[PDB]
Design an enzyme around this catalytic site. Sequence first.
Site, PDB file in Angstrom:
ATOM      1  N   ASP A 153     -48.213 -24.177 -12.020  1.00 29.92           N
ATOM      2  CA  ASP A 153     -49.492 -24.285 -11.324  1.00 29.92           C
ATOM      3  C   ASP A 153     -50.691 -24.100 -12.252  1.00 29.92           C
ATOM      4  OD1 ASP A 153     -51.106 -24.761  -9.185  1.00 29.92           O
ATOM      5  OD2 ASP A 153     -50.943 -22.743  -8.331  1.00 29.92           O
ATOM      6  N   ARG A 157     -58.752 -23.478 -11.593  1.00 29.86           N
ATOM      7  CA  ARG A 157     -58.879 -22.482 -10.536  1.00 29.86           C
ATOM      8  C   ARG A 157     -57.932 -21.305 -10.766  1.00 29.86           C
ATOM      9  NH1 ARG A 157     -56.063 -26.838  -8.913  1.00 29.86           N
ATOM     10  NH2 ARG A 157     -53.883 -26.424  -8.330  1.00 29.86           N
ATOM     11  N   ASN A 158     -56.879 -21.532 -11.548  1.00 30.06           N
ATOM     12  CA  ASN A 158     -55.860 -20.514 -11.795  1.00 30.06           C
ATOM     13  C   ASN A 158     -55.993 -19.868 -13.169  1.00 30.06           C
ATOM     14  OD1 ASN A 158     -54.655 -20.767  -9.290  1.00 30.06           O
ATOM     15  ND2 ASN A 158     -53.114 -22.238  -9.989  1.00 30.06           N
TER      16      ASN A 158
END
Lengths: 289, 289
Positions: A153, A157-158
């Site tokens: 992932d 955003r991560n």
Amino acid sequence: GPLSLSVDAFKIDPKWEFPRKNLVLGKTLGEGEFGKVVKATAFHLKGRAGYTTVAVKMLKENASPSELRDLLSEFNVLKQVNHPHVIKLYGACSQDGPLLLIVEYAKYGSLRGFLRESRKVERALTMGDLISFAWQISQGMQYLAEMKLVHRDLAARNILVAEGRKMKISDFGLSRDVYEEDSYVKRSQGRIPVKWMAIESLFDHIYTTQSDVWSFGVLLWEIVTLGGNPYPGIPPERLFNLLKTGHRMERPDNCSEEMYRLMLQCWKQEPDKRPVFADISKDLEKMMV
Amino acid sequence: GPLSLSVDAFKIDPKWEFPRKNLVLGKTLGEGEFGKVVKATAFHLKGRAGYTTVAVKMLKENASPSELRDLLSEFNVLKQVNHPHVIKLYGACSQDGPLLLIVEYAKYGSLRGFLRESRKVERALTMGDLISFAWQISQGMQYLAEMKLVHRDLAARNILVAEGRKMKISDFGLSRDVYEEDSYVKRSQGRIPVKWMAIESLFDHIYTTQSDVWSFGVLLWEIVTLGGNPYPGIPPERLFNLLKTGHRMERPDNCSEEMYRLMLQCWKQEPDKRPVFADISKDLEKMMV
Ligand SMILES: COc1cc2ncnc(Nc3cccc(O)c3)c2cc1OC
Ligand SMILES: COc1cc2ncnc(Nc3cccc(O)c3)c2cc1OC
């Protein structure tokens, strides 16, 4: 089932247990459909005198099996990783109350929100800055891959931005260990955004370090566009046909040719035709020299 | 994979296709991590002259495989159901643009937000009103079960309130057909909230009409408490041990004994020891006489 076994097994590592009475929770820093990250302060945390500011991740009241499993999974992974560019676990609260994850607080929040704020109104982000960020992240992935751990992932955003603009890979709830077979395979539909997944992950549900490389390519794109939306204007459901016919994102207006070539390399159809994270670091370093 | 097959197959029912040029999208009515419902207006919709106000469900730019699959699944189900207390599909937009679902607009929104607004500051909700709502919903489930369709996500947030306080079961993205084997089984962790799932669904991943009955029991609870939170103060991860040791929610301060007995019946451990939706309707009708 598998989750209930994990829940019962969790009851029975004292090193990571923190007393709830020492933890004060503050405002929400970020939210989702089944869980949120909150600002908090911790008293006498791991040999640190007085209060320490920290971040805390928890579920929401209506959380699902998937969200609970992800939290247990994120804790389990974070206990195993120590790296300058990987977020740092402090402990957890699980006795008499809701499960809470305690990590080092990241000053500027997510890299996506940081880049998007940067394009408004102390110092402006230069190209050298953006290359520095990618390299910091490349180093962290080179560490994870070397432990045969797949994040699954990777996205702006991560990634978190801490004091002095240091990158921190976060959100490990979906990451899997692949020591044995070098690939992780999910039979059901993932909960990873379509526009970030590799062609073989999207179609075949196959995840590896090389698919992490694909996602880093989209991450390179977010950075260069200061938090742009991948495949802009294109519906996610069109990605199947678009990628299977060999189409890729085009070069952003503010992106060097050297950087775009790297993106294209990360996006090769044949996964072994892609560079490994060691090559990416080397490439990025040559860019700043 | 399975999703790409569905996406390609979708390309090739003209009855349900609406021209995007006839659709104007408005404000957000509700959102999630990967999709939202929007207020819209439709010109010349299915033999209706002029503009018709409607609701539209779409994905967000960063939607995942799971969210895309759910939307395709919700459309597919809604094409098959027509009932006074089931939301009404009008059509969809899938040609040249993002997939959009068009349904009849529900005046007062979700039943949860409606009940919670009711407990503040034209007429106040009576007990008879609440029993009327449960019965309307019971009738809709009696229709679905009779088609061997399992909703899997019964909850006050997933019921809509339209003009004249009429209940509309919505959110069919997770519902499955169980004509053949009378049970649907998910190998991976569901994306249904822990506190609403039946004991055999939570532990064994087994879904049936009788597990829908369990969820209706929690729904009965939400209604009676005017939108209360199930198992209040209790962490979702504690539900495993709590239910396996035979514990259930206690009677709400404003709930008759007759109604609580029905809740307990819906919450029996043995799924066949629970009442069927025909019995629930009958029970609820006797309550208003
Ligand atoms: C200043 O803003 C933020 C600061 C944060 N600092 C630390 N961790 C965070 N998130 C986190 C913590 C634990 C696990 C995990 O995957 C992610 C943060 C999130 C923020 O904003 C969302
Ligand atoms: C007035 O507020 C709302 C009105 C609504 N009217 C219709 N459908 C909705 N939702 C919907 C539409 C299609 C599929 C599906 O599962 C759900 C609505 C949601 C609202 O608020 C969230």
